[PDB]
A paper describes a structure:
pmcThe BEN (BANP, E5R, and NAC1) domain is a ∼100-residue protein domain found in metazoans and viruses, but missing in nematodes and urochordates. There are nine BEN domain–containing transcription factors in the human genome, i.e., BANP, BEND2-7, and NAC1/2. The BEN domain-containing transcription factors regulate transcription by recruiting chromatin-modifying factors to specific chromatin regions via their DNA-binding BEN domains. Further structural analysis revealed that although all these BEN domains bind their target DNAs mainly through the insertion of the C-terminal α5 helix into the major groove of DNA, the residues of the α5 helices involved in the base interactions vary from one to another, explaining why they exhibit distinct DNA sequence preference.
We then synthesized a 12-mer DNA fragment with a palindromic sequence of CTCTCGCGAGAG for the crystallization study. We first measured its binding ability to the human BANP BEN domain by ITC, which showed that the BEN domain of BANP bound to the palindromic 12-mer DNA with a Kd of 8.4 μM. In the BANP-DNA complex structure, the extra C-terminal region after the helix α5 in the longer construct is disordered and unresolved in the structure. The BANP BEN domain interacted with the palindromic DNA mainly through its C-terminal α5 helix, which inserted into the major groove of DNA. Specifically, the side chain of S313 from the α5 helix formed a hydrogen bond with the base of T4, and the side chain of R316 formed two hydrogen bonds with the base of G5′ that is the second G of the CGCG motif. S313 and T317 also formed two water-mediated hydrogen bonds with the base of C3. In addition to these base-engaged interactions, S310, D312, K314, R320, and Q323 from the α5 helix and N269, S271, Q273, and K278 from the loop connecting α3 and α4 (called Loop 1 thereafter) formed several hydrogen bonds or salt bridges with the backbone of DNA. The results showed that mutating N269, S313, R316, and R320 of BANP to alanine individually reduced its DNA binding affinity by ∼2-5-fold compared to the WT BANP.
Numbering used by the authors: 209 to 324
The structure:
DNA sequence: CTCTCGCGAGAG
DNA sequence: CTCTCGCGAGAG
């Protein structure tokens, strides 16, 4: 619902209420991202940085499972990335499976940075 | 920085 | 048991 982020933007197709998610990204920032992120792979990781602070990435993963006892990244927010990539690039479930590896791998990089 | 792959420990 | 999947870290 728009109200959760009054100065924010929609992830995915605003005219399609089942595949939209209100988010905290401001219009000027969402403009930068669409200008700069010309592939689903590059938009996914840039969305990640605008939706989650690096300090959340360094403690969090997609499942919230594993040996490091990591927090799970907000599932509604992750669904919102899925909705933006499907809308912006018409990616498939097989692409999204690949993208999710890459989000988790970025999150491990951040954990390893805090580590080192 | 991103992308990837072999590993092996718990989930099923 | 088999299967999934979180993981470290070398290579791009």
């Amino acid at each position: 619902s728009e109200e959760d982020y009054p100065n924010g933007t929609w992830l995915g197709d605003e005219n399609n209420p089942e595949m939209r998610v209100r988010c905290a990204i401001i219009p000027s920032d969402m403009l930068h991202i669409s200008t700069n992120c010309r592939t689903a792979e590059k938009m996914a990781l840039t969305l990640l940085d605008y939706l989650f602070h690096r300090e959340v990435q360094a403690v969090s993963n997609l499942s919230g499972q594993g040996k490091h006892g990591k927090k799970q990244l907000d599932p509604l927010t992750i669904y919102g990335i899925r909705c933006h990539l499907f809308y912006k690039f018409g990616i498939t479930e097989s692409d999204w499976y690949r993208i999710k590896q890459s989000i988790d791998s970025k999150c491990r990089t951040a954990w390893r940075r805090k580590q080192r």
